C-alpha cells in the first residue's frame, strides 16, 4: 500500500538522524522539496514519538522543530488531519517550568495554527476552559497563548470575550484571565494594538468571589503593566477603578504584583489623577512596608520608587507619610540578610534620598552602622556611599556627618571579608565629604595606622588599601601630622612580603607623591628611591607594575636628584625585564627606557641597546627594537639614526634585522615626523634592496611600507618613487615571507604614492605571455582595485574600439 510505502521512504529521517552532513544535505533537500508529495501523513506518526522521546537532546529538538516549522510552512494544507494529535501531545509544554519548552512549543504551535485552520483549534479547546482541573486549565491557557502566537489575537478575541464572560463557571473566568496574563507574558510589546481589549476581558474578576480568579487577575494586571510599560500614553481611564478598589478589597501575591503594575500607572498619570491615585495608594503601601514576601518587596519598592518619586507628591507627604513605617519594617536585619532585599532596598532608598534629601534619611540609617549582622552595616554603607556619591555631601549637617564618619570607621575595622564593599564605601564617603573631613584626620589615620600594626597580614593589607583610597583628600585636610603620618608609616610597610599588599602600598605612595610634590615629601625621595631599587627585583606583576610606575614618576620629576650612574645601573637591570612572561611589564619597561633617555642623554642608553640586539631569542630582541624606536622618538631622530645605520654593517643576521625592524617602528612612531629622516635613510634601503639576501630584501621592504604610511601627505613622493624602482623587481618571488613583505610594501606605497603610479607599474603584465606573471599582476591589481577603486576611473588608459564593440569613453572627452 502506497501509504505504508510513503512512510517507508519517509523514514530517511534516518538519513537525517544518522549519517554524514552529506547525508543531511541529500535528505534535507529532498524532503524540503517533497514536503508536499511525501506529506505529513506518515511523518507525524514517525515524528511525534521522537519529539516526545525522553532524551532527544537540545539540538535534536532544535533540528526537529526546524523541521516541523518549515514542513508546516511548506504543507499548509498537507498537514491537515493530525491537528488535535499534535495539539494534545505537545500542549503541557507552554505551561512548563522549562522556559524553552514554553518557547519551542510556542513557536511550532504558532506555525502550526498559522499555516493550519483556526476552526479545529477552537472546536477542540473550548470545552477545556470550563474544565474542573486547574492543571488542565493552566496547560490549555498557556497553550492558547502559544496559539495566539501562531495565529494572532484578533481572530480569537471574541471567543476570549466568551471564555471570560461565562456565567456558568468561575473555573473558566479564571482560565480566560490567565490566558490574558499569559499572552501578556509571551508577546510583550505586541499587545498595544489591543492594549485595552484584554483589559476589558479582565474587568470582570478582580471583584470576583473566587480568590483564585481574583488574584490571578491581579497578576494579569501586573504582567500587562510589565509588557505595557513606557509606550501607552493613551486610553487607560476606562478601567482605572476596578484596579483601584481591588487593591484594598483584595489580598495576595497579585496585590504586590499589581503595585508594580500601578507603578507603571504612577509614571503614566497626571496631577488630579496622580495625586488622588498615589495619595490613596500610599496607605496601602504603609501597611505593606512590613510585608515579608520577596516579590512583594520587589513590586512595592519599585512602585514606591516611581510613586513617591513623582512631582505630584511634596517632600512633606513622603517624609511624614511613607518614611516611618517604611524605615521601621524594612530596616530590620531581615532585608540585608536577604540576597534580593539588600540591593533592592538599596535601589528604592537611594531614590527616596534623591527625593527628599539626606538630613533625614542619613539620620534614619545612622545607627544601623552599629548593628549585628555585618552584612547589615555593609548594606547601609553600600547605600550611603551610592547616595552621597551621586548627590554630594553639602546636604548632610554636623552631627549627621559625625555619626556617619564613625560608623564608617567601625565598618572598616569590623571588616571580616575580603571585599571592596567597605573600601568603596569609604572612598565615596570621603570623596563627597570633600573638604568637610578636616577635623577627623587624626582619628581616621590613627585608626588606619593601628591597623597597619596588626599581626595578621590581611588587616595590614586592608589598611594599606584604605590609605590608597583616601590618599588625595589626605591632601585636602592639609594634615601636617596626618599626611606626614601616612608618608612615614607607609615607608615602614615597604617591607611587606605579601605581593598583594606590597603593590597596594606602592600605589598609595604614588598617589601621595602625586598630590605632595617631591621636594616636600615626608620621607625625602632621597631616601625613598634608594629604598625602592631593591624592590624592582620582586618578580610579580602587580608589585612590579606599581614599582616601575613610582620610579618612573621620580625619574621624570626628580631626575637631577638621582645620579647618572644610578640610571645606568638601572638601565642594565631593565635589559632583562624584557623577558618577563607578562606583556604589561614589557611595555612599562620600554616606556621607562624612554624616560631615562630624556633625563640622561640618549647616547649611552642607545649603546646599551645595540649590544642587547646582539642577543638571541626574539622577544627580547624585538622589545629592544621597540625601545630604540622610543628613544629616537623622544630625543629627536637625528641623534640616533647615524648609529642605527652604521650598526647595519655588523655582519650578523639578528642584528641587521633588528635595525630594519627598529626603523619600522620609528617611522610608525614618527609617522609624518619621518618627513625628516626619509632622505637620510633612502640610500641605505636602496643599498639593501640591491641584493644582499632574502631576509635583506624582506626587511628593506618592511621599512618601505612603514615609511610610506608615515609620510602620507607630506610630499616626499620622489623618494618613494625611487624606492619603488627597487622594490618592484622582487615581485616575482616565491618565499612566503619575502613576497608577503613585498605586497605589504606595495599597499603602503599605494596610499602614499597614489594609485596612478601603481596602476602604471601594473599595466603591461596583466595580459602578458606567462601565467606566473599574469597571476602576480592580477593579485596586485586586485589589491590596488579593492582599496581605491574609485580614483582609477580617471587613471585608466585609452583602449581603442574594434569593429563590433565600443571601448572608448566619449563621456570623458566631451569638450566644454
Amino acid at each position: 500500500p502506497e501509504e505504508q510505502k510513503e512512510r517507508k521512504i519517509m523514514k530517511l529521517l534516518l538519513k537525517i538522524k544518522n549519517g554524514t552532513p552529506p547525508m543531511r544535505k541529500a535528505a534535507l533537500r529532498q524532503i524540503t522539496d517533497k514536503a508536499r508529495e511525501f506529506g505529513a501523513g506518515p511523518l507525524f506518526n514517525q515524528i511525534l514519538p521522537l519529539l516526545m522521546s525522553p532524551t532527544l537532546e537540545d539540538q535534536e529538538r532544535h533540528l526537529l522543530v526546524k523541521v516541523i516549522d518549515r514542513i508546516l510552512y511548506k504543507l499548509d494544507d498537507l498537514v491537515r488531519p493530525y491537528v488535535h494529535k499534535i495539539l494534545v501531545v505537545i500542549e503541557p509544554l507552554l505551561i512548563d517550568e522549562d522556559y524553552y519548552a514554553r518557547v519551542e512549543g510556542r513557536e511550532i504551535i504558532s506555525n502550526l495554527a498559522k499555516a493550519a485552520g483556526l476552526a479545529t483549534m477552537i472546536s477542540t479547546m473550548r470545552p477545556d476552559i470550563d474544565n474542573m482541573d486547574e492543571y488542565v486549565r493552566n496547560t490549555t491557557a498557556r497553550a492558547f497563548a502559544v496559539v495566539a502566537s501562531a495565529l494572532g489575537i484578533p481572530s480569537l478575541l471574541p471567543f476570549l470575550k466568551a471564555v471570560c464572560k461565562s456565567k456558568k463557571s468561575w473555573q473558566a473566568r479564571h482560565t480566560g484571565i490567565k490566558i490574558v496574563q499569559q499572552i501578556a507574558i509571551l508577546m510583550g510589546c505586541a499587545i498595544l494594538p489591543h492594549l485595552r481589549s484584554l483589559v476589558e476581558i479582565i474587568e470582570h474578576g478582580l471583584v470576583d468571589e473566587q480568590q483564585k480568579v481574583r488574584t490571578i487577575s491581579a497578576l494579569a494586571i501586573a504582567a500587562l503593566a510589565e509588557a505595557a510599560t513606557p509606550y501607552g500614553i493613551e486610553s487607560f481611564d476606562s478601567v482605572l477603578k476596578p484596579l483601584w478598589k481591588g487593591i484594598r478589597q483584595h489580598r495576595g501575591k497579585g496585590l504586590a504584583a499589581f503595585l508594580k503594575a500601578i507603578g507603571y500607572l504612577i509614571p503614566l498619570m497626571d496631577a488630579e489623577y496622580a495625586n488622588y491615585y498615589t495619595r490613596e495608594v500610599m496607605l496601602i503601601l504603609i501597611r505593606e512596608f512590613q510585608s515579608p514576601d520577596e516579590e512583594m518587596k520587589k513590586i512595592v519598592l519599585k512602585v514606591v520608587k516611581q510613586c513617591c518619586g513623582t512631582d505630584g507628591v511634596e517632600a512633606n507627604y513622603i517624609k511624614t507619610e511613607i518614611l516611618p513605617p517604611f524605615f521601621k519594617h524594612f530596616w530590620q536585619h531581615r532585608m540585608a540578610l536577604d540576597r534580593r532585599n539588600y540591593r533592592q532596598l538599596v535601589d528604592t532608598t537611594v531614590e527616596l534620598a534623591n527625593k527628599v534629601g539626606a538630613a533625614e534619611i542619613i539620620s534614619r540609617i545612622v545607627d544601623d552602622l552599629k548593628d549585628e549582622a555585618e552584612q547589615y552595616r555593609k548594606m547601609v554603607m553600600e547605600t550611603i556611599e551610592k547616595i552621597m556619591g551621586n548627590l554630594g555631601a553639602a546636604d548632610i549637617d554636623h552631627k549627621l556627618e559625625e555619626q556617619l564618619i564613625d560608623g564608617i570607621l567601625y565598618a572598616f575595622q569590623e571588616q571580616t571579608t575580603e571585599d571592596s564593599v567597605m573600601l568603596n564605601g569609604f572612598g565615596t564617603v570621603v570623596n563627597a565629604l570633600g573638604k568637610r573631613v578636616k577635623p577627623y584626620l587624626p582619628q581616621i589615620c590613627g585608626t588606619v595606622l593601628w591597623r597597619l600594626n596588626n599581626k595578621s597580614a590581611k588587616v595590614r593589607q586592608q589598611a594599606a588599601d584604605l590609605i590608597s583610597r583616601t590618599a588625595v583628600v589626605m591632601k585636602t585636610c592639609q594634615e601636617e601630622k596626618l599626611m606626614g603620618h601616612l608618608g612615614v608609616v607607609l615607608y615602614e610597610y615597604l617591607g611587606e612580603e605579601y605581593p598583594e599588599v606590597l603593590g597596594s602600598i606602592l600605589g598609595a605612595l604614588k598617589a601621595i607623591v602625586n598630590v605632595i610634590g617631591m621636594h616636600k615629601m615626608t620621607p625625602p625621595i632621597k631616601d625613598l628611591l634608594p629604598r625602592l631599587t631593591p624592590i624592582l627585583k620582586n618578580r610579580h606583576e602587580k608589585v612590579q607594575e606599581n614599582c616601575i610606575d613610582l620610579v618612573g614618576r621620580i625619574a621624570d620629576r626628580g631626575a637631577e636628584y638621582v645620579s647618572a650612574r644610578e640610571w645606568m645601573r638601572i638601565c642594565f637591570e631593565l635589559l632583562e625585564l624584557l623577558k618577563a612572561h607578562k606583556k604589561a611589564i614589557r611595555r612599562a619597561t620600554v616606556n621607562t627606557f624612554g624616560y631615562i633617555a630624556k633625563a640622561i642623554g640618549p647616547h649611552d642608553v642607545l649603546a646599551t641597546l645595540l649590544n642587547n640586539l646582539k642577543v638571541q631569542e626574539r622577544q627580547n630582541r624585538v622589545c629592544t627594537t621597540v625601545a630604540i624606536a622610543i628613544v629616537a622618538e623622544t630625543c629627536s631622530p637625528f641623534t640616533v639614526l647615524p648609529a642605527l645605520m652604521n650598526e647595519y654593517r655588523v655582519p650578523e643576521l639578528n642584528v641587521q634585522n633588528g635595525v630594519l625592524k627598529s626603523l619600522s617602528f620609528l617611522f610608525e612612531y614618527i609617522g609624518e615626523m619621518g618627513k625628516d629622516y626619509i632622505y637620510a635613510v633612502t640610500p641605505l634601503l636602496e643599498d639593501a634592496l640591491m641584493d644582499r639576501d632574502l631576509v635583506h630584501r624582506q626587511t628593506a621592504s618592511a621599512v618601505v611600507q612603514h615609511m610610506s604610511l608615515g609620510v602620507y601627505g607630506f610630499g616626499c613622493e620622489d623618494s618613494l618613487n625611487h624606492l619603488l624602482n627597487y622594490v618592484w623587481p622582487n615581485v616575482f618571488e616565491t618565499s612566503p615571507h619575502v613576497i608577503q613583505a613585498v605586497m605589504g610594501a606595495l599597499e603602503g606605497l599605494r596610499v602614499a604614492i597614489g594609485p596612478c603610479r601603481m596602476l602604471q607599474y601594473c599595466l603591461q603584465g596583466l595580459f602578458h605571455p606567462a601565467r606566473k606573471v599574469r597571476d602576480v599582476y592580477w593579485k596586485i591589481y586586485n589589491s590596488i582595485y579593492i582599496g581605491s577603486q574609485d580614483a582609477l576611473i580617471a587613471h585608466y588608459p585609452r583602449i581603442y574600439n574594434d569593429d563590433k564593440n565600443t571601448y572608448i569613453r566619449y563621456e570623458l572627452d566631451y569638450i566644454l
Binding site: 613622493e717 596610499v751 602614499a752 604614492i753 597614489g754 596612478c756
Partner: protein, 110 residues
C-alpha cells in the same frame, strides 16, 4: 588677491555652488602649526559619515602639501573637553589656537 593688500591666492569655483581659496604659507611655524592641529583633529574628531578624512582627501591620488582648512575651522564648533585636550597637546590656549585659526582667513579672505 581679494581684499586690498591681501597676499595672493587661488580661487576655485566648483560645479555645485561652492567657492573657495587655496592660500600659501609663509613660515614653517604656521605650517607646522596647522599641520599638527589637523593631525590631531582627524584622530579625535572624525567625520560624521563613517569616512576617514585622510582617505577622503586622497581619494584618487594621495594628498600632498595641502591642509584642510575646513577641518581645522571645526575646532570652534568642537566641545570644551576636546577643545582642551587638543589645544593642550599644542600647549597653547584655545584662545591661541582659535585666534590663529581666524586670522589666517583674516589676512587672505573674509
Amino acid at each position: 588677491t581679494l581684499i586690498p593688500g591681501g597676499s595672493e591666492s587661488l580661487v576655485y569655483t566648483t560645479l555645485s555652488g561652492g567657492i573657495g581659496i587655496l592660500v600659501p604659507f609663509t613660515s614653517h611655524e604656521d605650517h607646522d602649526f596647522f599641520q599638527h592641529v589637523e593631525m590631531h583633529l582627524r584622530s579625535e574628531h572624525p567625520p560624521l559619515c563613517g569616512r576617514d578624512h585622510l582617505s577622503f582627501r586622497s581619494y584618487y591620488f594621495p594628498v600632498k602639501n595641502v591642509i584642510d582648512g575646513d577641518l581645522c575651522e571645526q575646532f570652534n564648533s568642537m566641545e570644551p573637553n576636546k577643545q582642551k585636550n587638543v589645544s593642550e597637546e599644542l600647549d597653547r590656549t584655545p584662545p591661541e589656537v582659535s585666534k590663529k585659526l581666524e586670522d589666517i582667513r583674516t589676512r587672505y579672505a573674509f
